[PDB]
From Swiss-Prot:
Record's protein name: Host translation inhibitor nsp1
All copies of domain CoV Nsp1 globular, residue ranges: 1-106
Full protein segment contained here: 14 to 125 of 7096
Superkingdom classification of source: Viruses
Role, per record: Inhibits host translation by associating with the open head conformation of the 40S subunit. The C-terminus binds to and obstructs ribosomal mRNA entry tunnel. Thereby inhibits antiviral response triggered by innate immunity or interferons. The nsp1-40S ribosome complex further induces an endonucleolytic cleavage near the 5'UTR of host mRNAs, targeting them for degradation. This inhibits the integrated stress response (ISR) in the infected cell by preventing EIF2S1/eIF2-alpha phosphorylation upstream of stress granule formation and depletes host G3BP1.
Subcellular localization: Host cytoplasm
Region (Disordered), start-end ranges: 1-106
Taxonomic source organism: Severe acute respiratory syndrome coronavirus 2 (2019-nCoV)
């Protein structure tokens, strides 16, 4: 529910997505958020081509930001929500540059 997500530099990320289908990446992202093993990469130019699809975005749903998960594959998004805060990735020990406090609608 209340989470502080480590913000990772894209070139440091070891595991660059959660899986191979929309349903799987949403499931795995939720599991990693629950387990405290989820990182956040901020979306800047050149970032997404360095990550693996389907993407899982964390989006503002409405000092902890209420967020919802939205997946994207082939330019189609699954879920509808607000401003993108970043793309979620597994965290396997990478050193963050910041944290993002979020309230995951769960």
């Amino acid at each position: 529910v209340q989470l502080s997500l480590p913000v990772l530099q894209v070139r440091d990320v070891l595991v660059r997505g959660f899986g191979d289908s929309v349903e799987e990446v949403l499931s795995e992202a939720r599991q990693h958020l629950k387990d405290g093993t989820c990182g956040l990469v901020e979306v800047e130019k050149g970032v997404l081509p360095q990550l693996e699809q389907p993407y899982v975005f964390i989006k503002r749903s409405d000092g902890h930001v209420m967020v919802e998960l939205v997946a994207e594959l082939e330019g189609i998004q699954y879920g509808r929500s607000g401003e993108t805060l970043g793309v979620l990735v597994p965290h396997v020990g990478e050193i963050p540059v910041a944290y993002r406090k979020v309230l995951l609608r769960k």
